[PDB]
């Protein structure tokens, strides 16, 4: 995350770390939606151009974490993955349309002060909170700044608040063909505040707290942060609700 700050313990109990079994390596962020299911980005699992095609066996998730590298005994939980489901329409060749994937946990994970699920959104939640200007929150252990110039890897989880941005404005900020399945967020050029998600924050959650019920909802999945080395105007996120149906089709049907 660029231009964010140290997360408070338990500020985002649904934050998950997608971890490569060997070489042990942090791959992406992810979110806990129930004690058996985790959401992350499809490109965090599959990307043919770089030889990436992970199976449930090569990966692992770490839950309830704060420190990026320490073993948080008695606090974090490690879980194996039973299966990985990448949206069958995931577009990696061109624009990441449908950049989402579902991971079923080998066993249910216990909730605690540090492990608690985030709500998915419904029609009402979308149309009332997903609007230009409204700020959402992104969390991650991605890099602190572009590479090659301090220290770039955080030692603890990071948070940053970002404002959604008008679609037409998102579309005109890139040659990439944007779709209804995604949305962008971030401050403007002349804007005083920067703050963005970087590459290692991919797959993580974009969440908004309802003013109604006080419940947090995950509106998007970091699909293409615009920070650090990537630099583009705004960051792009997979539109969770827009994919809510595929999420049931997968769940109701496989676990």
């Amino acid at each position: 995350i660029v231009e964010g700050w140290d997360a408070e313990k338990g500020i985002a109990p649904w934050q998950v770390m997608l971890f490569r079994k060997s070489p042990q390596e942090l791959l992406c962020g992810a979110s806990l939606i129930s004690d058996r299911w985790v959401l992350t980005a499809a490109h965090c699992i599959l990307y043919p151009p770089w030889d990436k095609n992970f199976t449930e066996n090569d990966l692992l998730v770490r839950i309830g974490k704060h420190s990026r590298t320490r073993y948080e005994r008695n606090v974090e939980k490690i879980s194996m993955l039973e299966k990985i489901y990448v949206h069958p329409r995931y577009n990696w060749r061109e624009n990441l349309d449908r950049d989402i994937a579902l991971l079923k946990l080998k066993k249910p994970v216990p909730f605690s002060d540090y492990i608690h699920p985030v709500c998915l959104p419904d029609k009402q939640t979308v149309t009332s909170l997903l609007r230009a200007g409204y700020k959402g929150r992104v969390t991650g252990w991605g890099n602190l700044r572009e590479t090659w110039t301090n220290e770039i890897q955080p030692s603890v989880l990071q948070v940053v608040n970002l404002p959604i941005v008008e679609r037409p404005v998102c579309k005109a900020s890139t040659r990439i063909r944007i779709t209804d399945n995604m949305f962008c967020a971030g401050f403007k050029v002349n804007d005083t505040k920067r703050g963005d998600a970087c590459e290692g924050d991919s797959g993580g959650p974009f969440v908004m707290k309802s003013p109604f019920n006080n419940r947090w909802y995950q509106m998007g999945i970091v699909s293409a942060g615009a920070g650090c080395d990537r630099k583009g105007k705004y960051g792009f996120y997979t539109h969770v609700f827009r994919l809510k149906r595929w999420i049931q089709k997968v769940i109701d049907q496989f676990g």
């Binding site: 042990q24 390596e25 942090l26 770490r62 590298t69 320490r70 073993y71 005994r73 008695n74 974090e76 490690i78």
Partner: peptide
């Protein structure tokens, strides 16, 4: 060991 492990080992307290 240790500086050879970018991440502290995390299997204790397991299964």
């Amino acid at each position: 060991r240790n500086p050879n492990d970018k991440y502290e080992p995390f299997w204790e307290d397991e299964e």
